[model samples]
Target: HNYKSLKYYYSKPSIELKNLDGLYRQKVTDKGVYVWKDRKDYFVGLLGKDIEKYPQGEHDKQDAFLVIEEETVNGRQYSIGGLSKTNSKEFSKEVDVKVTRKIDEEKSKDSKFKITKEEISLKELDFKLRKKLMEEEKLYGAVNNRKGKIVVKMEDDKFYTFELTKKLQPHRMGDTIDGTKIKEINVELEYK
Candidate 1:
């Protein structure tokens, strides 16, 4: 089975909610550490919240949603996670085709900030390759306004597809007590 052809999986609702909370809390912390224990196997997800030094303003409060999915590749469990409201050019540009893997603690202390996983170039995939996978895999979801795609490798070695969407709103502290609920733009990906 070619695990490299696998893309992403759909996380359970409970896990998605948990990850959503984690994303918010993680943003407040200087460094974020996520530890997951599954039987004898242990997995850690590390992220740095302090990406910039600018102080947060009143309107800076943003609610973000994240989805995390796990798959076993070559006998090792690998995860493909996605975050909402991460529409900045910096993120999309920096993450193009690169599966930024996190380095274990033994590698380097700064590994938390540095991406350690294999960086696969989406540009390397041809239209035929994508069409082949789309035909073979179940449609799970899409990402990046449909410009980007997600695929999952099942235990049976079949690939699945899915889409991710994000919505952002300017945080208003007073809205809780007296402000009115306002609707904002929603980000969605169109799957072909």
Candidate 2:
């Protein structure tokens, strides 16, 4: 059977992937790691349990293979598995295709972060607050704001803001700021 051509699959149809099953393309972003059998088509979301099997992060383009197994608990269930393929791409295309995989929230809980304060400099922030700023900064692209600033939810359910800015101070305390090497941006937090 041509499994790739099966339109009934819950995931969206991908034109970029071949109808035959084997290795596919993978991409990682703020949302999560994703792989597509077809680049021109839609992608399937990856689960947390399967994350460790693949090369991680937003920059690297890697190859992943799919494993399908039919399990009978009471009814027939087909489980799709995305796993890292390290050996060779001779069976598939040699070039890596960049993709954005949508992640299911319940599948992984690591993506969420729980932030505060108004008009505070990252350097001026104490260890407790500095960590909060960095935590929010980590979710830079995931959280949406019409502006470029980072917004995070606080304990009280109120939302605060953080912005990335360049200044004389180093990103972290006791660190030297030099343009030729190791340059960093200071984040400013604002509740107002």
Candidate 3:
């Protein structure tokens, strides 16, 4: 009889891994060690089984992978894993796309025009090249007033996405601020 065990899979010392499939699955294309930090004081998803690190924040779970969570244990943090809920930026999944075009109404009670807004779907782009096109259009082309162009739906159909500010959009990637790196702005969208 053959079966799958979350503990049996994660409790191992080493595992075979494939390189970046997309942003959500892309982590160290060569396969050695994938490392990250968690904002929360507690570990993310480890009950001495499966995944860990406050291990993945939630966005990184788009694709399946193995984790080595038992070795080099500490109460403060867990060992390394391939992908978690936090790190993976590219994977095969569909995210909510809202294409908002500014329109000028000829007849108006006031000056502000009505927006021609519609919800659209963008999918099948899972590489560094094409995926960033969606990221860029959604990132820069739209104003995030709790309304975004790219929304990533994760586990249990929970929708998620992130955004940046006017003062920090031009900031270089990998720059740290206040102790945490100013990597990117994260927006948790809820107005569905």
Candidate 4:
């Protein structure tokens, strides 16, 4: 007895990637047209210099809204498209820095803090670490992310903790922490 089974054929799904919000884009530096589809980004005239400074991340940030030209021959569309010099005024305002910092306060001298009388640069200090430094007389330095630094200090003799969550960057140029515009400062514990 010979048994035969019918063969099943499946065709790839046709998704239009030419003019989408996150698909058609050009390289940030070399201005090479590229496409992001099926979880891959590529283009022709692909040279080392094109990808060196203008990687996918850089392209994703900028030049993603460049006017693009699509070409379809015989019902087959190319992945990448031709780019025009026309610029779109879709301007996006970007904040310099964005991050979170958690502060914890506890009793004891060496408890969850950095006792540093020497002023430290925001970049050099640990961005994500518990700190308890001796209270300075005036406005001082604090932790920081890539873009900006947060200036902080203990308000009183009692132990205090500071944590940053969902806020703009903080700069140093004042006599007190109140002017820095850090709206949220959690008070973990206090001594009355």
Best by TM-score: 3
Q: Over the stretch 41-136, how does candidate 1's per-residue lDDT look in tens digits?
A: 211222232223212211121222222335443343332222222122222111112121122222211111111112211111122223333443
- Selected candidate, larger TM-score, 1 vs 4: 1
TM-score, candidate 3, is 0.23
Give the alpha carbon lDDT tens digit for every residue of 1-192 in model 4. 001100000011223233322323243544334444456444422233323333444233222211111544223333222211112332222112212223333432222332221222221122222122212111122222112123333334232132222111122100112112222222222211
How many pairs collide in each candidate, listed in order? Answer: 11, 6, 16, 3
How does residue 143 of candidate 1 score in lDDT?
A: 37
What residue pairs clash in candidate 4, if any at all?
113-131, 113-132, 114-132
1 or 2, which is superior by lDDT? 2
Once fitted onto the true fold, the runs of candidate 1 whose alpha carbons sit more than 4 angstroms away are 1-7, 11-44, 50-145, 148-182, 188-192
Q: Model 3: per-residue lDDT, tens digit, 1-192? A: 011221233123332222323222123222122333333121212222222222222233322233234444334333222232222232222223333332332221111111111211111111111224324433223333222223334334444232212111111111111201112222222222
Ranking by TM-score: 3, 1, 2, 4
TM-score of 2: 0.20
Candidate achieving the largest lDDT: 2
The per-model lDDT (C-alpha) reads 0.24, 0.27, 0.25, 0.25
